Design a protein around this ligand. Sequence first.
Ligand SMILES: Cc1cc2nc3c(=O)[nH]c(=O)nc-3n(C[C@H](O)[C@H](O)[C@H](O)COP(=O)(O)OP(=O)(O)OC[C@H]3O[C@@H](n4cnc5c(N)ncnc54)[C@H](O)[C@@H]3O)c2cc1C
Ligand SMILES: C[C@]12CC[C@H](O)CC1=CC[C@@H]1[C@@H]2CC[C@]2(C)C(=O)CC[C@@H]12
Length: 501
Amino acid sequence: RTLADGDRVPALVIGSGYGGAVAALRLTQAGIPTQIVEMGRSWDTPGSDGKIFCGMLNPDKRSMWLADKTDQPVSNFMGFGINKSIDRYVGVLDSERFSGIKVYQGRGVGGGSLVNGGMAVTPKRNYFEEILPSVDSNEMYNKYFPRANTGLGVNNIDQAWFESTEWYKFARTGRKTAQRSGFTTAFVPNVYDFEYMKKEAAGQVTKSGLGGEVIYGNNAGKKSLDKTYLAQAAATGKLTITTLHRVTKVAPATGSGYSVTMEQIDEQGNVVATKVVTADRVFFAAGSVGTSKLLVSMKAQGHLPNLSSQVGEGWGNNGNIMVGRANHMWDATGSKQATIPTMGIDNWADPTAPIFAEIAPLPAGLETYVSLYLAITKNPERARFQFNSGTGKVDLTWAQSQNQKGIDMAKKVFDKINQKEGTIYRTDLFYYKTWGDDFTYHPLGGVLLNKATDNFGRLPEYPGLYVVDGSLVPGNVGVNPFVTITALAERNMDKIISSDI
Ligand SMILES: Cc1cc2nc3c(=O)[nH]c(=O)nc-3n(C[C@H](O)[C@H](O)[C@H](O)COP(=O)(O)OP(=O)(O)OC[C@H]3O[C@@H](n4cnc5c(N)ncnc54)[C@H](O)[C@@H]3O)c2cc1C
Ligand SMILES: C[C@]12CC[C@H](O)CC1=CC[C@@H]1[C@@H]2CC[C@]2(C)C(=O)CC[C@@H]12
């Protein structure tokens, strides 16, 4: 059963996304009874319509975390994406507003794996060696990265099927125009079962990726963490998952261990109870934003006053920038679009315009002629979290203007394709904005490896406290982050379990 006030637990993992799922798997396999505390719900119970998740075409209360309206980056575009009113509910996608950026995050058992596009990319070794020089890259490349990819269930699309299917016409068009401008394109591996997708196209199985589902969950096909790491962790019989509990405070307990305060909420987000449990070891896996907010609050409120001054520093947005281009009539993108991106434009090696851009679907169900892109740029800008005395809240200092360096990098590539194709940008996808620069899907940093923590995620001032999630990464990895977070967690857990436990 779930955690009760007064309980004493060997290992408590806060959060159940990538870092938390790796921690839980490795701890329980080591034979350590482990409690995961997750603020969202378990997504294994059908809603009204008999399905677990809602699709993007007709979202309902299941879409958003405690909100009165849906929120998608593309709004009111040709019948698609219009924000509708919903009941407040513990829905799957949180659009967390800070002053200069909104951070999209998954909420529920599996964290971001529930809502993400499944793109599983291993960073370039050269860049990896440069941004994380304290990490033994041989171990990462010979062992931890492969371990992560295999554990996550990464697979590749059948390229012959890709070429023929109407569902990926948008990607073929995006590839064609990138290549005509001299840019390199690459297939991108994914945790979505591509064999299942072929059956979807054949009309043989329930459509998910071919049925307008992704950011509010996938009823089928996508290997979210509850199907991989967490299923394996639960299989040991040593895992307990406590859902609908938000951790609010961590402080040294008397005698040993740490007191963990949590708010139990009902499905409407009302706090129904407050509990305190004592844990010998605590693994922060609440995500780049969640972990940073917790540690910054704990330090500023005098609960963990000895934390490093580096706590809260070095947050980045993985240089996320979105943009859409108009194609001419002969470069249709298709009325049937898979929701799972499979193709990227890799220009990272170009020091003048270092970007990796995925060709994203805009599944509106009609021909829009739009090529949509999500670009990861090598934006050097960073921000920090800081506790605000007046409000009792943690603020993020990121300013929207800090995205300008990323836009300039992206522009260099997209302007070149626009010149070759004689096309213009769309300005109606995001308030007459061309560049989608006020949100990120990829928050990274805040509690940097070997800066705020030791070289393995330990908080040295408080033995037994560990950080295992995206807050460790220095703001940008040059590709979709989850494979990196998983592999880094794999590395750290290996050392912690072998050294500390
Ligand atoms: C819409 C979307 C699309 C994306 N697409 C891709 C993609 O295709 N490929 C890729 O590599 N990455 C992608 N990402 C990013 C990827 O999902 C994240 O990098 C990744 O999930 C971060 O892992 P994490 O373990 O750090 O934290 P998360 O996965 O964010 O998990 C944090 C967990 O902790 C829980 N939590 C938070 N605070 C508390 C608290 N105080 N108490 C209890 N529980 C708490 C949260 O509810 C959540 O379940 C995308 C993200 C989104 C949101
Ligand atoms: C690119 C991304 C977000 C990144 C994911 O990995 C894949 C993905 C699929 C559908 C896209 C979404 C961005 C926002 C979009 C464009 C919408 O608003 C509806 C469809 C959505």
